[PDB]
Write a protein that binds this ligand. Structure first.
Ligand SMILES: Cc1ncc(Cc2csc(CCOP(=O)(O)OP(=O)(O)O)c2C)c(N)n1
Ligand SMILES: Cc1ncc(Cc2csc(CCOP(=O)(O)OP(=O)(O)O)c2C)c(N)n1
Ligand SMILES: [K+]
Ligand SMILES: [K+]
Ligand SMILES: [Mg+2]
Ligand SMILES: [Mg+2]
Ligand SMILES: [Mg+2]
Lengths: 42, 324, 349, 324, 351
């Protein structure tokens, strides 16, 4: 469901951030590597 | 009816010869001898010398014979004894027939099916088992089919033969009679360019063709014992590829690997990876890795064991992608 | 040590391939025995066609110079080898021409303007009319030979009383497809006429560097078939050789290899200007009162004119689009093409 | 000295002919005539008919000759008039020379450099401009080299000839005299399997070879006018690929596109993609897209300009990637 | 209508290639003048080698059934064609064999055990000893021909007074490479001797299906070079024909094509011909000269068996091939991809 480049997903995984819990502020709702840093921050 | 892929082959040919009088089968030792692998056994005896005949020893000439006969309304199904000998007839296939419809704007066409065995695992001598599907997969105007089961073989060959554009039907030596399967009697067809999911999976997609399909299934079984569910996709047509089935399995698994018997620098694994990278990169958890043979000339007989990719190599690579 | 008669061997075989000649340079019948049975009207139509072709060549070179034509291989000097041979064929015969054999397929039914589209590089130039049995000019030297063997076997199997005729140059005889072609045709006893037009050169390579065989006709011996060496500059000898081969062929006896000796007028002082086929044949016909300067000029004006409207039909042909190229790849387009087709259909709009 | 690419190719041959008595140049119309494109111009005059000679019209024999000559200590540098004719000599190349060392386990080797022109944009007739590098890139034992400039052609050709294994040297027609560039006199080498950055950039990596390098440089300059800094990497050797250079650039840019004149199902673009996906998928901010020709037979001359990929196609594909 | 002498041409040309013979089935000389000049010791060695090759075929077929040998093409019945022709060569000559001409390259210097390794499919089987001028048996029917032309041109170019000899079967004469090879050699006037061993078959295809040419040697006519048809079952005829061709070649007069009429006693890889056997007629020939005897033949036979047994042992003691080995012999300077892969496998080979 989600859409994110591999760099994002493997960054999410490292940080242990279940990618399905992060929204995404990129085109068509793509989860950007900045949306995960904002999931951990807040 | 329990048939071996080779029998399934013979049956598809028998069926076409009977259903269409234009079908002609020729090549080196395919007549009275019935072929070096019995693929055409008893065919000349049933349909005549005028329909199933032998030819002088010259692959190039065979190609030309096919092209010519086609220009006269026949549906040539010539045979190249071993695909390693495709080099002698590379112009007839890639420089000629594959281009006739386009070259003549449709005025002429080539309903030709070239059958040829290949594949390792049976200790053949030099240039018999080389996987060269990669060369022809690159020529606009051709379709390359590679079955792994008797059922797929028959249905694809009948389709192959009926197609009105040149088709290359490669037959793996190790799959000729290594197992039997329920093959329906009578004529049926399997669309060309259509993949086939041999095993539904949810963790990783394992794409393969030829002898590598069964090795992917054998590896899937082991992978399950380890908590990894593998969806094994059998291409069954290496050109054109069934993108729809490929990406669909990928969009679902999020992980994948392509498995071929050819050398890494050959085959068609690189093209599948590319197609996935541009259509489903937004679904991939890890890179798509390839399982292929070392980049050396096909192995001397004795070295096939340590050289040819097997289930163990599919297992190991599936894991690597799994723990990326 | 005693010696094998190798010298005697080469001299003997050579003796089996003398040059067949019916007319000399002055237009005199030097071999009345093999004289071809041709009607006055037939004889004239042959002269007309040869003249027409010389004009097509001259105009083709000019149009190429002006950039109104693209790829073009001169034919001047080979009118007898090309036209007279074509003259011995029937509508039902299939021709597999080389890159230089555009003349032959034009007279067999291919419209002149398409011949020009072929030169420019347009697919419509290769959309041969149905019924007209020819293939677009073959660029891969020798490929037309093995294909000719397949075409011939096809006619044989359909029971047709027609033949497969194809041409290649002297250089082409060194190719493998050349040999395999005539061998296959031989092993199947197929109705095929194999013509080797020898103008002594393959681009800059003289025939002597191609092979050490004294004739190119003798190469037929390797296929186990009959070979004929003809004066490629004599229209009647070329016609007689081909007519003889068509007959041997439709009567189920097999193929024949024919070598015509001729020369090109330049591109692709001197001599051979007296050997020009149009010269002797003209003298031949004039002596029989079958040709006038008036008639010839009529043919010329008729030519220059038909050439103009042909270059005009070519110009008026619609430019090619990618979607066209794709549409003619297969009967049923594969996924990748179905896809690319839309991509370009959108660009095109 | 300011040279054209064909001039540099000649200079390099001349240098090798003088430097090594074993070097031999042969093929169709290369001797007295000096080559259809004047590539061997004057070489026969200076070194003799024993060193630079013409052969009968038959590519297969030319290949067989080179193999034989190499068995007798020579360093064969044969020519194939147009690579569209490689079909006639596929066995001698891929089935023989490329395998000799391997087949003989080192006892014999093939110091053979095969030269052959190819390329579109000059309205040549059929099978004269096809891009078939994709076929030979798949054969273990060969090295495929495709220069884009005078400087590179001369350096690689000297390297190509000195190499002791088979090397295919593809010379693009449009680049023979399209331009001049300063080229060092005397001998020098450019390693095989090494690419170079024809233009430094930071926003997107554009990988190309052949006439496409120029088209890519052209798109780069148009892109720079819009603040899009493109790095153009010239493969200069299509097999083996220079991975470090390629990957090093993508890791810096985050985005990339591979460009080729060949059709999408041909060329070596797909290999480049799979390798990037395999070694730097974690640096990608967008899929690695490809710019290639439609999957149809090479276009009839008049259709070249609407079929052949150009700078406008590259810009567009680069933008697709930027805006992903 | 006019008619060309097509039937005459076919006959007349073929007539130029009558079957050259010296020893008939009973071992009776029939071509005294052609009689090659060989010493008693030379004739005995020639017999020794043919008898030895027979046993090798008999043993090879056997080991191949036990699985101790892989690919193998029988040679029984072709001794005179294969052995007698090789007996005409000098060590300096270069041989380019076909998949069935292992014997020739064996007698030219290739160790028996490497010939067996070739069958098994092992690279060391093709590491021809330096100085031994042979190539591994060629599998692509026809390739050895165009390659032979090159070797020959190469020898001419270096001024060596030697030749290049290559072999192919009847079916192989239909290949384009077959024709291109003899046309090139002839065009370059290169010192090559092309042999065609006609056993009437190409696997299951009779030579009549290959071509309609009355003879195979006449094909040389397409290359404009000399051709000779010889009794493939006649040692002396073959020795002489090849010797004349070598002679012609070293004197720079060009290549020659030689067709040998023989028969292999099957299979691919009849009691009538049993009398046409080359060993039979040659035995009688030597015995009537007091040059041969059962004692001598039993010696060679045992000698062959012993060496064959030992060779099959050496092949077994050859270290099994590894991928690292295969990768290393691909190039002199391994390309990047192979460098990477070499480590992968070197690692995998650690344990
Ligand atoms: C397989 C292949 N190799 C080379 C070439 C290139 C070529 C085009 S034309 C030509 C010379 C042919 O001379 P020939 O005497 O046979 O015919 P003619 O023009 O009347 O003098 C060559 C070598 C092509 N097209 N195909
Ligand atoms: C280019 C190619 N195409 C087909 C084959 C397959 C083959 C291997 S052996 C053989 C028959 C050869 O018969 P021939 O009479 O020539 O020789 P011999 O066995 O001594 O009687 C074939 C067709 C190979 N190897 N290469
Ligand atoms: K088909
Ligand atoms: K080299
Ligand atoms: Mg061939
Ligand atoms: Mg010519
Ligand atoms: Mg045989």
């Amino acid at each position: 469901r989600v859409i994110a480049m591999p760099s994002v997903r493997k960054y999410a995984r490292e940080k242990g951030v279940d990618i399905r819990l992060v929204q995404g502020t990129g085109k068509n709702g793509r989860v950007l590597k900045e949306d995960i840093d904002a999931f951990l921050a807040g | 009816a329990q048939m071996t892929m080779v029998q399934a082959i013979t049956d598809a040919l028998r069926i076409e010869l009977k259903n269409d009088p234009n079908v002609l089968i020729f090549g080196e030792d395919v007549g009275v001898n019935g072929g070096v692998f019995r693929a055409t056994e008893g065919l000349q005896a049933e349909f005549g010398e005028d329909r199933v005949f032998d030819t002088p020893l010259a692959e190039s000439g065979i190609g030309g014979l096919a092209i010519g006969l086609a220009l006269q309304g026949f549906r040539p199904v010539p045979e190249i004894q071993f695909f390693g000998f495709v080099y002698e007839v590379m112009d007839s296939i890639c420089g000629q027939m594959a281009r006739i419809r386009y070259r003549t704007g449709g005025r002429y066409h080539m309903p030709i099916t070239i059958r040829s065995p290949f594949g390792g695992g049976v200790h053949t001598p030099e240039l018999h088992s080389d996987s060269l599907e990669g060369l022809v997969a690159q020529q606009p105007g051709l379709k390359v089919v590679i079955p792994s089961t008797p059922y797929d073989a028959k249905g694809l060959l009948i389709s192959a033969i009926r197609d009105n554009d040149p088709v290359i039907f490669l037959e793996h030596l190790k799959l000729y009679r290594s197992f039997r399967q329920e093959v329906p009697e009578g004529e049926y067809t399997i669309p060309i360019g259509k993949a086939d999911i041999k095993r539904e999976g949810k963790d990783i997609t394992i794409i393969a063709y030829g002898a590598m399909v069964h090795e992917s299934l054998k590896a899937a079984a082991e992978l399950e014992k380890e908590g990894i569910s593998a969806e094994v996709v059998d291409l069954r047509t290496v050109q054109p590829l069934d993108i729809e089935t490929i990406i669909g399995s990928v969009e679902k698994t999020g992980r994948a690997i392509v498995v071929q018997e050819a050398q890494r620098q050959a085959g068609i694994a690189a093209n599948v990876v590319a197609e996935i990278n541009e259509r489903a990169i937004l679904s991939l958890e890890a890179p798509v890795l390839r399982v292929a043979a070392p980049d050396t000339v096909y192995p001397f007989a004795q070295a096939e064991s340590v050289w040819l990719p097997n289930f163990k190599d599919v297992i190991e690579t599936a894991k690597k992608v799994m723990n990326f | 040590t005693f010696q094998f008669p190798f010298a005697e061997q080469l001299e003997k075989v050579a003796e089996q391939f003398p040059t067949f000649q019916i007319l000399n340079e002055e237009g005199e019948v030097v071999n009345e025995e093999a004289m071809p049975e041709l009607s006055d009207e037939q004889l004239k139509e042959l002269m007309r066609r040869m003249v027409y072709t010389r004009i097509l060549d001259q105009r083709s070179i000019s149009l190429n110079r002006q950039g109104r034509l693209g790829f073009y291989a001169p034919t001047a000097g080979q009118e007898a080898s090309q036209i007279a041979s074509h003259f011995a064929l029937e509508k039902e015969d299939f021709i597999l021409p080389g890159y230089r054999d555009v003349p032959q397929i034009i007279w067999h039914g291919l419209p002149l303007y398409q011949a020009f589209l072929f030169s420019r590089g347009h697919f419509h130039g290769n959309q041969i009319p149905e019924g007209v049995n020819v293939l677009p000019p073959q660029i891969i030297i020798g490929a037309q030979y093995i294909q000719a063997a397949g075409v011939a076997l096809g006619l044989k199997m359909r029971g047709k009383k027609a033949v497969a005729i194809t041409y290649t140059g002297d250089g082409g005889t060194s190719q493998g497809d050349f040999y395999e072609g005539i061998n296959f045709a031989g092993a199947f006893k197929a109705p095929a006429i194999f013509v080797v037009q020898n103008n002594r050169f393959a681009i800059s390579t003289p025939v002597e560097k191609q092979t050490v065989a004294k004739t190119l006709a003798q190469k037929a011996v390797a296929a186990g078939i009959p070979g004929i060496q003809v004066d490629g500059m004599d229209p009647l000898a070329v016609y007689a050789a081909v007519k003889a081969a068509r007959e041997r062929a439709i009567n189920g006896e097999g193929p024949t290899l024919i070598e015509t000796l001729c020369f090109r007028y330049g591109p692709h002082e001197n001599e051979w200007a007296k050997k020009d086929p149009l010269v002797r044949f003209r003298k031949f016909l004039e002596a029989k009162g079958l040709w006038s300067e008036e008639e010839e000029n009529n043919v010329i004006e008729q030519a220059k004119e038909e050439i103009k409207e042909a270059i005009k039909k070519a110009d008026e042909t619609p430019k090619q689009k990618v979607t066209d190229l794709i549409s003619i790849m297969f009967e049923e387009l594969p996924f990748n093409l179905k896809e690319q087709y839309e991509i370009y259909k959108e660009k095109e709009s």
